[PDB]
Ligand binder design. Structure first.
Ligand SMILES: Nc1ncnc2c1ncn2[C@@H]1O[C@H](COP(=O)(O)OP(=O)(O)O)[C@@H](O)[C@H]1O
Ligand SMILES: Nc1ncnc2c1ncn2[C@@H]1O[C@H](COP(=O)(O)OP(=O)(O)O)[C@@H](O)[C@H]1O
Ligand SMILES: [Mg+2]
Ligand SMILES: [Zn+2]
Lengths: 571, 49, 619
DNA sequence: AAAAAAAAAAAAAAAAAAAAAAATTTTTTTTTTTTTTTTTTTTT
DNA sequence: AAAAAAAAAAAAAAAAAAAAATTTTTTTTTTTTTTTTTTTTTTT
């Protein structure tokens, strides 16, 4: 073991002196209260001292306390101006330290338990981000031996509670004296107080009768999130293990249901309270949250799943949706910029694989086959939580903004079919069922796959794939896939280009009005099922193609390629 | 007892910058006296209790 | 609930391990460790002034909060004595730390042992009052189950001062299977335990006030170091005791003083020497061995004039003869006893006070101050057990020591006869119906009687003029007659001496306000104690020449012709006078460090008796 | 010098103070196991 | 389209667990008091 006064001196000199003053700029910003959270980096601390880093890895919580108090004492010399007191909480802390100065009597000694505590008066928070040397360990493998140890984990989210105010330091005021006592909370529960240990009360022999209130207290942004093993992490036959993670301060509202996360934290226990001993629950106290691995033209479309061959126009339309047609809300009525595709196909052309690649691709994606997600799996339902009937979502509401890759749409349940019709038509999901009376909001885009009328009449593109056996086509595809087995754009760069492409917002020009109306009527005569939905289809595809070009104005080239795609699909 | 701790507080502040060891504020007894005539030991009835 | 580390304990143990580490210094505490290891004693006495000079703050801390501090000290002691010898350090489950030195503010008396000194090692002088039976206390108790062939060792913590729980105090008697357990007394481990009671000395205490006393719990290592009546300085931890369990408490906390050590406050067992002093004594003996008795005799009792024969005789007393215990226990004494009889203002009482201040274990007895049962021993019942205990008297306290009898003439005949067996055989055979014993008081007696009529009449015979029986004057072996001649010439002598001593001052130490072998020869005018102390042990056997000469001179003294007419005997010449001759000869030889009593010492003894006994009554 | 009288000592017995010693099941809560009812999802 | 299997939610009951709780009496100890013996001291 060591001496933690020495450790605090070590980290104080470190935080002052390491680098542009890397940590110094952060310190002065939080001193002025231009940031509320701080993040230590064990790579940046292994830059000089490895023993301290190994100790942090092995007993991280204590050093968290050390670092935070060290920065708290470094605060005022870095402070340089009068902050504007942006919060009533700021008013309280300023008033508190003001009256402490007023009745200071600096020579006068005060007890070891008569002082405003750090956890109350800090007003900032300090977290970490574990070193690259620290391998992220399997959620199953983070056992009792790793309690207190600093540990990073990578897992999928299943469900996440909302931001409700956890208590940090309850504040009580008296009925006679007027002092203000604190109960610093740590655990899931606290017994309230009813008597005031203020020395005026001890002198008076008065009934304390202090009353808790929220005004002088210190709440915090608290969430309990769930996480689940990676299906690749899971062993041969066991189901994926879960884990509970606790999210505080400026770590709140990062992860969301369905999004992969990497959380860096410590695996601390709670009291369990039927075999003897002293049992205890386990929660991982998050200290850095980073979404990762899903939610961080011609060559581009060919880059969309290079392992598939042919279907070039299909890939181009897939790229187009991934860019997304322009979102419009003109005159109240919504004209959503979603693009809905269905792939009817002969048995086996890698349509499921295309859906899986889009699932791996999009920043929000949910790949649902027939019956694994049915009823509540696609819809939203009710569950016990602060215990409560928390209404949470299924696949589509998880994919509220993204892409639902629905597989085998032909054989879905009829309720699932009805819900998907609703979401494609109006991007809501109305429910008036047994214990649910809601209208979920689901701004999702549908990629249906199926095997061979309502489909044709409610969509923006249907594609029939008939692998008519052509010798040269099959020869080239066979060479291609055999080469794939033989040898076994980057996804991140592709997704970056798409992400930037999402936000150019073109507005249609007047020059193309005659062209688009003429093309619409001509397509109608060539038909004589097409209608206003197909008009909106060509128009959305034109907007999205302008987005792909990145210009803010749609042109004749865009509409030409749109008609090219739709002609290829229909034929 | 109020007088006793009052004496204690004023004592610590007057001797305030004390040296090592002698810092825990020691208890300050407050004995009394007067100038009035003492009353006889036979005059302690119940009412003067 | 084992402590991983404490900065306080680690710091204190490091400091005291340094304090014990004595090689770069002179090696004093290392030598103390080595000698106590050689002795098998297991307490080491650390001087508080040493601790203060090396680290004042630790001295302040320890003298303010003892027990845990001394736990640190004793753990350091165990580690240190293990480094010197691990085998011996393993031998004793604990080693202890006695104290010594200038406990400046921490020196009070039991009247002044206030409630400010709790858990502080207080220093306190005082007289013992009680001596409880030194009885065992069990510390580690072993048991044997014969049904299950099992052995157990219950363990006890000496919570004489802290809180104690029944779970700690259980003495097991049955196993888990309700079998019978038989104690293994020998395999168990015990420590002695005694209570005593120190008291404020009546010479120190306030004159008109009741005594005040403090209770002292001597555990092992300090069993018999304090009997009733002794002067003792106790240094140790005043604390509080736990009331036994019970839902109520008054605030009362009867307090004790768990003594850290106790030493003889008499400070008269003082053989403190150095090798240089031993060599000094050796040369002082051997260079001028033949004149050394007269050197010592003239030296002894400065601040008084003449009386050279009496100084020689008091030397013969203090140096002592040699006690003899023959084959069958016929114990022939080896002490001198002197009766000063002489006119008033002859410094007889001043000689008595000199030997009181100098001779180790000297004690004063007045005529009607001490009386019989006080003088010799006594037998009294306990009243707590109805058993007869023995209360040692003045003489028994003065066993192998000196008693100064002021105004011996005034002791009534009962006590004057009660002193008989102590005078001859140096024992008091006391007995009442329950208990009897022969207490041993090998005492020596210097007794200053005064003459009948208040002053010696020259013409009257000494036997008429002394109000003491021939019976007793036999037992006394020398009777010295001190007359005030009143001549102006010797008056000039004595007067100049006396007023010179009135003019002698503390050299330099004083300004005008009132309160080495040889001495720096101050014109106006320690090693005495050193040399006489070493002198006492030697047993100089009598030579054939000395025995024949002393025998013939005794025969001459017995014969009436040896005294001329007009002289009157002062003490009849019984065989006690011959034994006096032998004892005085041995005392002279012991002065010389002879290893044999020779004719020189024999003729000195015969000169002594011839001057002392036969007196010239004038007409 | 020995007898008589008085004083003190030794030892047993009693009165109060204050610290020790002894006695000592029954009613309420609440988790867990089991059953029951209304509803939704699925199958004939 | 009707039947039925399953699901979640709600409730009852039995087993285990939770919680509440000073007063009276006895015995050692200390301290004096009283008796009787022993001792010492004064008298003829
Ligand atoms: N060009 C290609 N690249 C990679 N895989 C291919 C290709 N052509 C065919 N496949 C294979 O076809 C198989 C069936 O695809 P699948 O997604 O099941 O289509 P569907 O589910 O629509 O029938 C996949 O296992 C895939 O490996
Ligand atoms: N031999 C002496 N030498 C010097 N001074 C003497 C001598 N004898 C007596 N004195 C003086 O006479 C005083 C007599 O005191 P002290 O001895 O108490 O009385 P006493 O002699 O009657 O016992 C002493 O203080 C001392 O100063
Ligand atoms: Mg498929
Ligand atoms: Zn209050």
């Amino acid at each position: 073991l060591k001496d933690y006064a020495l450790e605090k001196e070590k980290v104080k000199k470190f935080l002052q002196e390491f680098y542009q003053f890397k940590y110094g700029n952060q310190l002065v910003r939080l001193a002025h209260r231009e940031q509320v959270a701080l993040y230590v980096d064990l790579d940046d601390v292994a830059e000089d001292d490895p023993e301290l880093v190994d100790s942090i890895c092995e007993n991280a919580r204590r050093y968290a306390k050390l670092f935070a108090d060290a920065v708290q004492e470094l605060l005022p010399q870095y402070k340089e101006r009068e902050v504007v007191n942006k919060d009533v909480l700021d008013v309280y802390i300023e008033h508190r330290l003001m009256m402490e100065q007023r009745s200071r009597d600096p020579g006068m000694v005060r007890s070891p338990q008569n002082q405003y505590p750090a956890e109350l008066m800090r007003r900032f928070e300090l977290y970490f981000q574990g070193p690259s040397s620290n391998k992220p360990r399997v959620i199953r493998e983070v056992r009792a031996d790793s309690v207190g140890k600093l540990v990073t984990v990578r897992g999928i989210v299943t469900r996440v509670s909302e931001v409700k105010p956890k208590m940090v330091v309850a504040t009580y005021t008296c009925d006679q004296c007027g002092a203000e006592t604190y109960q610093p909370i740590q655990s899931p529960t606290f017994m309230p107080l009813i008597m005031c240990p203020s020395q005026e009360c001890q002198t008076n022999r008065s009934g304390g009768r202090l009353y808790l209130q929220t005004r002088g207290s210190r709440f915090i942004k608290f969430q309990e999130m769930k996480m689940q093993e990676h299906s690749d992490q899971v062993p041969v036959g066991n189901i994926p293990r879960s884990i509970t993670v606790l999210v505080e301060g400026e770590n709140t509202r990062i992860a969301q249901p369905g999004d992969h996360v990497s959380v860096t934290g410590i695996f601390l226990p709670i009291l369990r309270t039927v075999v003897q001993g002293l049992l205890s629950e386990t929660y991982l106290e998050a200290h850095r949250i980073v979404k990762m691995n899903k939610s961080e033209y011609e060559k581009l479309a060919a880059s969309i799943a290079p392992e598939i061959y042919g279907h070039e126009d299909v890939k181009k339309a897939l790229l187009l949706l991934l860019v997304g047609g322009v979102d419009q809300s003109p005159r109240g009525m919504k004209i959503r910029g979603n693009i809905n595709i269905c792939l009817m196909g002969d048995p086996g052309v890698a349509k499921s694989q295309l859906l899986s690649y889009i699932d791996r691709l999009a920043p929000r994606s949910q790949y649902t086959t027939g019956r694994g997600s049915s009823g509540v799996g696609l819809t939203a339902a009710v569950l016990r939580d602060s215990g409560e009937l928390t209404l949470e979502g299924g696949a589509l509401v998880l994919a509220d903004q993204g892409v639902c890759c629905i597989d085998e749409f032909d054989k879905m349940a009829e309720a699932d079919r009805t819900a998907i019709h609703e979401v494609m038509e109006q991007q809501t999901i109305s429910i008036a069922k047994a214990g649910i009376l809601t209208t979920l909001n689901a701004r999702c885009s549908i990629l249906a796959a199926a095997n061979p009328a309502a489909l044709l009449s409610r969509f923006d593109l249907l594609w029939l794939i008939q692998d008519r056996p052509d010798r040269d086509n099959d020869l080239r595809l066979a060479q291609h896939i055999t080469y794939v087995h033989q040898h076994s754009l980057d996804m991140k760069l592709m997704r970056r280009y798409i992400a930037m492409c999402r936000e150019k917002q073109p507005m249609v020009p007047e020059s193309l009005a005659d062209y688009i109306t003429a093309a619409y009527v001509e397509m109608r005569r060539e038909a004589w099922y097409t209608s206003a939905r197909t008009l909106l289809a060509i128009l959305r595809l034109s907007t999205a193609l302008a987005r792909l070009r990145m210009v803010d104005v749609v042109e004749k080239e865009d509409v030409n390629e749109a008609i090219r795609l739709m002609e290829m699909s229909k034929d | 007892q109020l007088l006793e701790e009052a004496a204690k507080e004023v004592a610590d502040e007057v001797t305030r910058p004390r040296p090592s060891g002698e810092e825990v504020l020691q208890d300050i007894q407050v004995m009394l006296k007067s100038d009035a005539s003492p009353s006889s030991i036979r005059s302690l009835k119940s009412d003067m209790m | 609930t084992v402590v991983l580390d404490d900065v306080e304990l680690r710091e204190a143990q490091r400091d005291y391990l340094d304090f014990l580490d004595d090689e770069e210094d002179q090696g004093i505490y290392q030598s103390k460790v080595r000698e106590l290891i050689s002795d098998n004693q297991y307490r080491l006495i650390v001087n508080v002034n040493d601790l203060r000079r090396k680290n004042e703050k630790r001295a302040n801390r320890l003298l303010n909060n003892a027990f845990e501090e001394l736990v640190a000290f004793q753990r350091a002691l165990k580690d240190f004595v293990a480094s010197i010898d691990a085998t011996y350090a393993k031998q004793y489950e604990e080693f202890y730390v006695g104290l010594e030195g200038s406990f400046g503010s921490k020196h009070v008396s039991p009247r002044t042992l206030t409630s400010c000194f709790l858990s502080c090692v207080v220093c306190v002088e005082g007289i013992v009052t009680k001596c409880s039976l030194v009885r065992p206390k069990v510390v580690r108790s072993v048991h044997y189950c014969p049904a299950t062939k099992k052995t157990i060792e219950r363990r006890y913590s000496d919570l004489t001062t802290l809180v104690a729980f029944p779970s700690s105090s259980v003495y097991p008697t049955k196993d888990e299977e309700n079998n019978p357990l038989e104690t293994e007394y020998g395999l168990s481990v015990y420590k002695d335990h005694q209570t005593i009671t120190i008291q404020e000395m009546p010479e120190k205490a306030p004159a008109g006030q009741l005594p005040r006393s403090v209770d002292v719990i001597l555990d092992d290592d300090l069993v018999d170091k304090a009997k009733p009546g002794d002067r003792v300085q106790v240094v140790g931890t005043y604390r509080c005791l736990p009331g036994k369990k019970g839902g109520y408490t008054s605030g009362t906390f009867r307090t004790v003083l768990i003594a850290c050590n106790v030493k003889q406050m008499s400070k008269d067992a003082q053989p403190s020497f150095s090798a240089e002093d031993i060599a000094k004594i050796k040369k002082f003996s051997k260079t001028r061995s033949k004149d050394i008795f007269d050197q010592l005799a003239k030296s002894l009792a400065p601040s008084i004039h003449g009386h050279d024969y009496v100084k020689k005789a008091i030397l013969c007393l203090l140096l002592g003869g040699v006690e003899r215990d023959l084959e069958n226990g016929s114990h022939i004494r080896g002490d001198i006893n002197i009766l000063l009889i002489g006119d008033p203002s002859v410094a007889k009482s001043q000689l008595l006070r000199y030997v009181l201040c100098t001779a180790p274990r000297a004690i004063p007895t007045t005529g009607r101050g001490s009386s019989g049962v006080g003088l010799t021993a006594a037998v009294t019942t306990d009243q707590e057990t109805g058993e007869r205990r023995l209360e040692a008297g003045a003489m028994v306290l003065a066993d192998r020591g000196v008693v100064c009898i002021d105004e011996f003439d005034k002791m009534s005949d009962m006590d004057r006869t009660a002193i008989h067996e102590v005078m001859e055989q140096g024992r008091v055979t006391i007995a009442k119906a329950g208990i009897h014993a022969r207490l041993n008081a090998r005492c020596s007696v210097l007794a200053a009687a005064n003459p009948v009529y208040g002053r010696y009449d020259q013409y009257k015979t000494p036997m008429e003029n002394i109000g003491l029986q021939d019976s007793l004057l036999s037992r006394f072996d020398l009777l010295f007659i001190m007359l005030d001649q009143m001549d102006p010439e010797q008056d000039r002598e004595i007067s100049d001496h006396v007023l010179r001593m009135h003019r002698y001052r503390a050299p330099g130490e004083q300004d005008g306000d009132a309160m080495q072998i040889y001495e720096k020869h101050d014109n106006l005018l320690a090693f005495m104690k050193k040399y006489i102390h070493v002198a006492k042990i030697i047993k100089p056997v009598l030579t054939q020449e000395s025995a024949t000469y002393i025998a013939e001179e005794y025969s001459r003294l017995r014969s009436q012709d040896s005294m001329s007419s007009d002289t009157a005997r002062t003490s009849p010449v019984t065989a006690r006078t011959l034994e006096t001759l032998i004892r005085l000869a041995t005392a002279h030889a012991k002065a010389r460090m002879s290893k044999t009593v020779d004719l020189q010492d024999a003729e000195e003894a015969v000169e002594l008796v011839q001057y002392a006994y036969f007196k010239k009554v004038l007409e």
